[PDB]
């Protein structure tokens, strides 16, 4: 009876595609053509945070827009003072193959995870004065690719076993499991309301999930290669992805389709990171060609280039207030731009 | 809370990072790769849901960090990028299983031509060579069924200065090597070099072979770093 179900699934996919085509009246470029452009954007390396031994795989800004945590593949987490380049903490990891790091919105916890399939939670605010592992979240059968805090007690972790999981930190158990993806899920982004989150997997598809419901609300299939990065538009009604086919794409939840592609014939390298400015007009993406690119989110033009890194730039993020942009790379250096 | 006191704390963190840098550069990291039929697990035991296994061993006061991968999915095109800038890749091949020896060639081809593994040398361990002779001395299974080019292959002038073994064993074991060096040569540049070896199940020279092979990988890294090439 598998053939009938496959035919019905194909019919449903055709219906969804027909609805998406019907909703498509005009492109985003057709609306933003008659608007003022952004112009050449020149950002300068205000700070350069050194100290990591091996390549930097991930970074995350604190909610105060001054503290940022970074993950290096030598088994080290460092919390920097971005204003003064000071080192606040240096947390050694049990496994040296960490691939993600998260800062709690309250600043009291930091999370990391890698090839060990375990999400370690570190308490930065301890009476003992040091930083200790408060909880290790085991239960994934694949490497951890991303993790983001919802609060001091809830966290969502992406994993290479094609599954995203919501965790309860005190109990250390998966209160919700998301099992829709086909390939390894490589990134996740939380909505501003923390009611939804998007995922990006190696199946060239992106899914919108409901945290409380636990079901896949929406699915986006614009890319043609593994999605390596994902980020939410500041208003929460759109999100941008970065994949290995050297293009960035803007999807909208309400439109249920793709609005623009941020690509160029010159760039032939995959996108490792993606981020939005405070207003959402600027789309910043990291590439394998050792430099980051600044994109006009509404006009799909190249506003500027961040070209100070000596190796693959793997992570990049904008502060909460939009003041600066921090980019990490495989050259073991973090650079802050303005 | 004086800011000058926060600078000294940061300076104290750098002192720990610099003394942790001495151990990182002095330690040689290795990645074990191989299938289930290969004796990869036996090689692990002969040195002295968790997604990674780490084995630490010393040869002539040199630290080696071997990283066996387990509890992962079948596809590996993403987590293999984490093993860039590594000293060497230990690839273990079951020579006896001629049926699955072809898929090992494709596994080696993908690793050797990987964009992020372009500068990493591979230490091939053709394991279970004792069972290879038994599968060719008996004559029940022959290579020519799978590889039509074995009939036109003859042993070169210098090969196998062993204390003693059957002539067809030498011709069989050097054809398996040949299929690997052609991949390492025709599908790769001179940045990284394959290091074929013949290993058994219980073999106590395996740690020495890795040490000698890693001494050569660093030697060519030093030659290019000092512009002596």
């Amino acid at each position, epitope marked *: 009876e598998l053939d009938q179900l496959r035919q019905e699934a194909e019919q449903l996919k055709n219906q969804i595609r027909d609805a998406r085509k019907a909703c498509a009246d005009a492109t985003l470029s057709q609306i933003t053509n008659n608007i003022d452009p952004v112009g050449r954007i020149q950002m300068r390396t205000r700070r350069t945070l050194r100290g990591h031994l091996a390549k930097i795989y991930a970074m995350h800004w604190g909610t105060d827009s001054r503290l940022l945590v970074s993950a290096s593949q030598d088994g080290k987490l460092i919390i920097w003072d971005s204003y003064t380049t000071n080192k606040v903490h240096a947390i050694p990891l049990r496994s040296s193959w960490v691939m993600t790091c998260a800062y709690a919105p309250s600043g009291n916890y930091v999370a990391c995870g890698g090839l060990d399939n375990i999400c370690s939670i570190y308490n930065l605010k301890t009476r*003992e004065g*040091n930083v200790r592992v408060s909880r290790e979240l085991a239960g994934h059968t694949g490497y951890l690719s991303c993790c983001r805090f919802l609060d001091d007690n809830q966290i969502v972790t992406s994993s290479g076993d094609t599954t995203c999981a919501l965790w309860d930190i005190e109990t250390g158990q998966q209160t919700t499991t998301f099992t829709g993806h086909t390939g390894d899920v490589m990134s996740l982004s939380l909505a501003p309301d923390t009611r939804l989150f998007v995922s990006g997997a190696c199946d060239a598809s992106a899914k919108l999930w409901d945290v409380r419901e636990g079901m896949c609300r929406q699915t986006f299939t614009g890319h043609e290669s593994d999605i390596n990065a994902i980020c939410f538009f500041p208003n929460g009604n759109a999100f941008a992805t970065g994949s290995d086919d050297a293009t960035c794409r803007l999807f909208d939840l309400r439109a249920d389709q793709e609005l623009m592609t941020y690509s160029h014939d010159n760039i032939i390298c995959g996108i490792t990171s993606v981020s939005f400015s405070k207003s959402g007009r600027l789309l910043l993406a990291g590439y394998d060609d050792f430099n980051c690119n600044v994109w006009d989110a509404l006009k799909a033009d190249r506003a500027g280039v961040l070209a100070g890194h000596d190796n693959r730039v793997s992570c990049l993020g904008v502060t909460d207030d939009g003041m600066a942009v921090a980019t990490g790379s495989w050259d073991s250096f973090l650079k802050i731009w303005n | 809370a004086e800011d000058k*006191a*926060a600078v000294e704390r940061s300076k104290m963190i750098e002192k720990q990072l610099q003394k942790d840098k001495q151990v990182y550069r002095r330690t040689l990291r290795l990645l074990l790769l191989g299938a289930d039929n290969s004796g990869k697990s036996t090689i692990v035991k002969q040195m002295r849901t968790s997604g990674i296994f780490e084995t630490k061993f010393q040869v002539d006061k040199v630290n080696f960090h071997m990283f066996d991968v387990g509890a992962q999915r079948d596809e590996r095109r993403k987590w293999i990028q984490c093993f860039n800038d590594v000293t060497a890749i230990i690839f273990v091949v079951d020579s006896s299983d001629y049926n699955r020896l072809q898929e090992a060639l494709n596994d080696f081809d993908s690793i050797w031509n990987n964009r992020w593994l372009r500068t990493i040398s591979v230490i091939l361990f053709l394991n279970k060579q004792d069972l290879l002779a038994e599968k060719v001395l008996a004559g029940k299974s022959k290579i020519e069924d799978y590889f039509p080019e074995f009939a036109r292959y003859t042993t070169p002038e210098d090969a196998t200065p062993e204390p003693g073994e059957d002539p067809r064993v030498t011709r069989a074991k050097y054809f398996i090597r040949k299929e690997f060096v052609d991949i390492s040569t025709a599908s790769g540049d001179g940045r990284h070099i394959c290091y074929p070896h013949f290993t058994c199940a219980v073999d106590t020279e395996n740690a020495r072979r890795i040490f000698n092979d890693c001494k050569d990988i660093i030697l060519q890294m030093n030659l290019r770093e000092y512009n002596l090439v």
Partner: single-chain antibody
Amino acid sequence: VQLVESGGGLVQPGGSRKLSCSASGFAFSSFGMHWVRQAPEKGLEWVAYISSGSGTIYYADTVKGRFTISRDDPKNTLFLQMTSLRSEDTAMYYCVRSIYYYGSSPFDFWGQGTTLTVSSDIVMTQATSSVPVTPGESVSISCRSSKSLLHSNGNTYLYWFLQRPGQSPQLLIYRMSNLASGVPDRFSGSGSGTAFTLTISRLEAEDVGVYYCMQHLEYPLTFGAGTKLEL
């Protein structure tokens, strides 16, 4: 977290003695340590300070060259060697935990105290010295400084301490606006650059004691006279 300190007794006006503090329950090597003396029926006075790593060391002008502070990270012990012990060196010497990074709360833990009896600087002034009040009524302690404690970077280095009768000083407000951990929301601090106010919403039985003000803009760290609350 614990800081048990030994050494004391009666010392002659020409003798010497060593004060030691045994730390336990926390990473001693990652913290800076202070010595604070409290003369009988008088206020607090900072004595010395050793940073994390036995690097930067500061002394008070009245003990500089006469006192010396030493650290022992492996044993989690901090020592204070006094060479000459004058008559005015009789007080209870407190040991204070201290850590310094962005967002940290120094002077957050104090030792139980050890007594020793012997047979320009910023002036922090507390206008009042005794304020009687009944429980449930809101009071407001005020303080002043010689110059502005508001630094250029944007934070005011004013610290609030409470010494309950028979108890060690306890941090309530650090940097003039941040509530310390383990203390109720009722306490709060205010001020602009030179006049600072500490106000408690609902006075309780455990809020009775002497309230001290401290500045950390630059060494030496100077305390206030002390404003006792009665009931």
